[PDB]
C-alpha cells in the first residue's frame, strides 16, 4: 500500500516494471580490479546547451565510497543523499573507524530504506557502490528491489547484456591492475554512439588510497590512445 | 507568585421543615482593603437550589459558572432539572476532579429535595460532602457555627422541647448570628443577602450591617 507492494501470485509486477524502467540507457559500467574499483558512465547530454561540470553522474558518498547509477536520476539524487546521511550517521555512531569498506557492505545493507520501504512508488534506479578501506576493494550493486550482489564487473544500461558479455569475454579477470579503467572505457565504447570525449564520459576510481572522481583532464588522457 | 489569596466572605445555610435559608455576606476584600460592599456569595441555580461560595472569589465565580453550564447540559440531556442531591454529587465530582490543584472555596448547597424537605449539603474544598440540617462556611465559620447548632440543635440544653424551626424564627436567628459575626470578623459585614427557598420560589432580602 504505502510500502513496496503489488506482488501477485509468484510475481512482483511493480518491481518488474521498475526493473524495466531502470534498463534506462546509461551503461554505467563497473569493474572491480585488484588495486581498486572503477565506476565509469556515459554523460550524453542532449545538444550542447546542457553543461557537464554542472551535474554529475558519479557522487562520492564519503571519503572512499563512490556511487554510479542508472535511469531515473531524480530518484538517484534522493537515494545518494540518503546514502550520504546513513554513512555519516554510521560514522558518527561508531566514531572514527574511517569506515569505507568495512562500511561498504554495511552501507549496502542499510540500502533497505532504499527499496524495502519503497514509498508507494519504488525507486527506479540501480546503483553501483565502490569502497576500498579494508585492504581489498569492493563492488556492490543495489537494484530497485533487491539488495547487495557483490559484483566484480557489470553494466546497467540499455545494452547491459552485451556490456556484461564484453566484460566477461574481455576477461575482467583477477590479476588486472588498477588501470582496468581502459577496459571499462572499452566496455562503454560498445554501448556508446559517438566520439566519446572528456565531458561525454564521467568516471570515478576508488583505490586503497581513497575515492576520486576523475577530472576531464585525466578522462581525456585515458581516452587518448584508445 | 502564588495562585491563591483569601478573599473572605461568610456563607450559611439552614434546612427547615419546608424551607431552605441560604444567607451570605456581600463584602469582598483581601489583605486590608475592601473591594466592594455589594458582592453576593449566594447564587441561585434552579428554582429550588441556591449555593453559597466563600473563599477565593475567582474560583467561586468559575465554579458557579461551571455549575451553571453543567446544569444546563444535564437539563438538555435529560429533559428535566437537577435534584439538589444530584447537584451536590456533581459539585463533589467537580471539586475532586481538580484535586491536585483545588478550588480554594467552601460550598454549601441549600434547597429542597424531591420530598419537599429542606436539604443542606456542606462541602470541603477538595470534594468531601455530607447532608446536614445546617452548616456555615467561610472566615466566620468558627464564630458563627456554635450559635446555630446550640440553638437549632438544642445542644447542651435540657428540659426544652425540640420544636421545629419556623421560617421567621430561623430568619431571626440568621440575622442575629450574622450581626454578631460581622463585628468580630472584619471580613463579615456591610450587608447580608438572605435567600429563602420554598415551593413558591426564591425570595431574597438584603439587610444592612456594620459599615466598618
Amino acid at each position: 500500500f504505502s510500502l513496496t507492494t503489488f506482488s501477485p501470485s509468484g510475481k512482483l509486477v511493480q518491481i518488474e516494471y521498475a526493473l524495466a524502467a531502470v534498463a534506462g540507457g546509461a551503461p554505467s559500467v563497473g569493474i572491480k580490479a585488484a588495486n581498486g574499483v572503477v565506476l565509469a558512465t556515459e554523460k550524453k547530454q542532449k545538444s550542447i546547451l546542457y553543461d557537464e561540470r554542472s551535474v554529475h553522474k558519479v557522487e562520492p558518498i564519503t571519503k572512499h565510497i563512490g556511487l554510479v547509477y542508472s535511469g531515473m536520476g531524480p530518484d538517484y539524487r534522493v537515494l545518494v543523499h540518503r546514502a550520504r546521511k546513513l554513512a555519516q550517521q554510521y560514522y558518527l555512531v561508531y566514531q572514527e573507524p574511517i569506515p569505507t569498506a568495512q562500511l561498504v557492505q554495511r552501507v549496502a545493507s542499510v540500502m533497505q530504506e532504499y527499496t524495502q520501504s519503497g514509498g508507494v512508488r519504488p525507486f527506479g534506479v540501480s546503483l553501483l557502490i565502490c569502497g576500498w578501506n579494508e585492504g581489498r576493494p569492493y563492488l556492490f550493486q543495489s537494484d530497485p528491489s533487491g539488495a547487495y550482489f557483490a559484483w566484480k564487473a557489470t553494466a546497467m544500461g540499455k545494452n547491459y547484456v552485451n556490456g556484461k558479455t564484453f566484460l566477461e569475454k574481455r576477461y575482467n579477470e583477477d590479476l588486472e591492475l588498477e588501470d582496468a579503467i581502459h577496459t571499462a572505457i572499452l566496455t562503454l565504447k560498445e554501448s556508446f554512439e559517438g566520439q566519446m570525449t572528456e565531458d561525454n564520459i564521467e568516471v570515478g576510481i576508488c583505490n586503497e588510497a581513497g575515492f576520486r572522481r576523475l577530472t576531464p583532464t585525466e578522462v581525456k588522457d585515458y581516452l587518448a590512445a584508445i | 507568585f502564588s495562585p491563591y489569596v483569601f478573599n473572605g466572605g461568610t456563607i450559611l445555610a439552614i434546612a427547615g421543615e419546608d424551607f431552605a435559608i441560604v444567607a451570605s455576606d456581600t463584602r469582598l476584600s483581601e489583605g486590608f482593603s475592601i473591594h466592594t460592599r455589594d458582592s453576593p456569595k449566594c447564587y441561585k441555580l434552579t428554582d429550588k437550589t441556591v449555593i453559597g461560595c466563600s473563599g477565593f472569589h475567582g474560583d467561586c465565580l468559575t465554579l458557579t459558572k461551571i455549575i451553571e453550564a453543567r446544569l444546563k447540559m444535564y437539563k438538555h440531556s435529560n429533559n428535566k432539572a437537577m435534584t439538589t442531591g444530584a447537584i451536590a454529587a456533581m459539585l463533589s465530582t467537580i471539586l475532586y476532579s481538580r484535586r491536585f490543584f483545588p478550588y480554594y472555596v467552601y460550598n454549601i448547597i441549600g434547597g429542597l429535595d424531591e420530598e419537599g424537605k429542606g436539604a443542606v449539603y456542606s462541602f470541603d474544598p477538595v470534594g468531601s460532602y455530607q447532608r446536614d440540617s445546617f452548616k456555615a462556611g467561610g472566615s466566620a465559620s468558627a464564630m458563627l457555627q456554635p450559635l446555630l447548632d446550640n440553638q437549632v440543635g438544642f445542644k447542651n440544653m435540657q428540659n426544652v422541647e425540640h420544636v421545629p424551626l419556623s421560617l421567621d424564627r430561623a430568619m431571626r436567628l440568621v440575622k442575629d448570628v450574622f450581626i454578631s459575626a460581622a463585628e468580630r470578623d472584619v471580613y463579615t459585614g456591610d450587608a447580608l443577602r438572605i435567600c429563602i427557598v420554598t415551593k413558591e420560589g426564591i425570595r431574597e432580602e438584603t439587610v444592612s450591617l456594620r459599615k466598618d
Partner: protein, 237 residues
C-alpha cells in the same frame, strides 16, 4: 454515473452531485415550518409517528433558553449538530455571559458543515435545520441545508411536500409582523396542515410547537400545551 459517486469529485456540468443528493435527505423527512414575527419566533413541526403504539418521535430540539432548532431528515447526524450548537452556546455563556447571537451560531454551523463537503471519506450532514432564536435584533429564523449554505428567512418550511407550506407562507407573509402570539401560531398550524394530504389532520399528539420571544424563553409545547393554540383551527384540510 461515475461523477456522482463521491463528494470530493466534481461533475463536468458544474456543481457536484453528492451534495445535491444530500439535499434530498431533508426532502425525505417530516415537514416543519418556522416563521418570524415582530417579537416572537415560532416553529411548527410534524411529529411523524412510526405506528399508533409507538410515540410520534421527537422534533423541535432544545438548544438554549433563547435558541431552539427543528430537524428534518437524517436524524443520525442531527443530534450531533444539536450537541455542537449546545456546546457553542454554552461556551459563549461561559466566556462572556451573554446569549450567543443566532447569526454567529449559524455561521459557525455552516463553517463546521462545510469541511465534510470537501474532506474525502466524510459525508455531508444531510440535515435541515430550522433554527429559531431571539437575539437583540428581535426573533430570527434560519434554514440550514446540508449544502452548508444557510439562509435567513421571514418564514421557511422544510420537509416532505413542504412546497405547499412554502407557498402558503409566502402568500400570508405580508401579515406576519403584526400578529399576536396565538395568531402567528395558528398561521403556522394552517401552513403545516396544508402540507399533509386531506386524510391527515392536525392532532395534539402529532404536532410540536417551539416558541421563543422577548420575555418568553424558548419552550417546546406539545399536546396539552398545544391544545390552546390548536383551538380555532379553521380546518380546511
Amino acid at each position: 454515473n461515475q461523477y456522482d459517486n463521491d463528494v470530493t469529485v466534481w461533475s463536468p456540468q458544474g456543481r457536484i452531485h453528492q451534495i445535491e443528493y444530500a439535499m434530498e435527505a431533508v426532502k425525505q423527512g417530516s415537514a416543519t415550518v418556522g416563521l418570524k414575527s415582530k417579537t416572537h419566533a415560532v416553529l411548527v413541526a410534524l411529529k411523524r409517528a412510526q405506528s399508533e403504539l409507538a410515540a410520534h418521535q421527537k422534533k423541535i430540539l432544545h438548544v438554549d433558553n433563547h435558541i431552539g432548532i427543528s430537524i428534518a431528515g437524517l436524524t443520525a447526524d442531527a443530534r450531533l449538530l444539536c450537541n455542537f450548537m449546545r456546546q457553542e452556546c454554552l461556551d459563549s455563556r461561559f466566556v462572556f455571559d451573554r446569549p450567543l447571537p443566532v447569526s454567529r451560531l449559524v455561521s459557525l454551523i455552516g463553517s463546521k458543515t462545510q469541511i465534510p463537503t470537501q474532506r474525502y471519506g466524510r459525508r455531508p450532514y444531510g440535515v435541515g435545520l430550522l433554527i429559531a432564536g431571539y437575539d437583540d435584533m428581535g426573533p430570527h429564523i434560519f434554514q440550514t441545508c446540508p449544502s452548508a449554505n444557510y439562509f435567513d428567512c421571514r418564514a421557511m418550511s422544510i420537509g416532505a411536500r413542504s412546497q405547499s407550506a412554502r407557498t402558503y407562507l409566502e402568500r400570508h407573509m405580508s401579515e406576519f409582523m403584526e400578529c399576536n402570539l396565538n395568531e402567528l401560531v395558528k398561521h403556522g398550524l394552517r401552513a403545516l396542515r396544508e402540507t399533509l394530504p386531506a386524510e391527515q389532520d392536525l392532532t395534539t399528539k402529532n404536532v410540536s410547537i417551539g416558541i421563543v420571544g422577548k420575555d418568553l424563553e424558548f419552550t417546546i409545547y406539545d399536546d396539552d400545551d398545544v391544545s390552546p393554540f390548536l383551538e380555532g383551527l379553521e380546518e380546511r384540510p
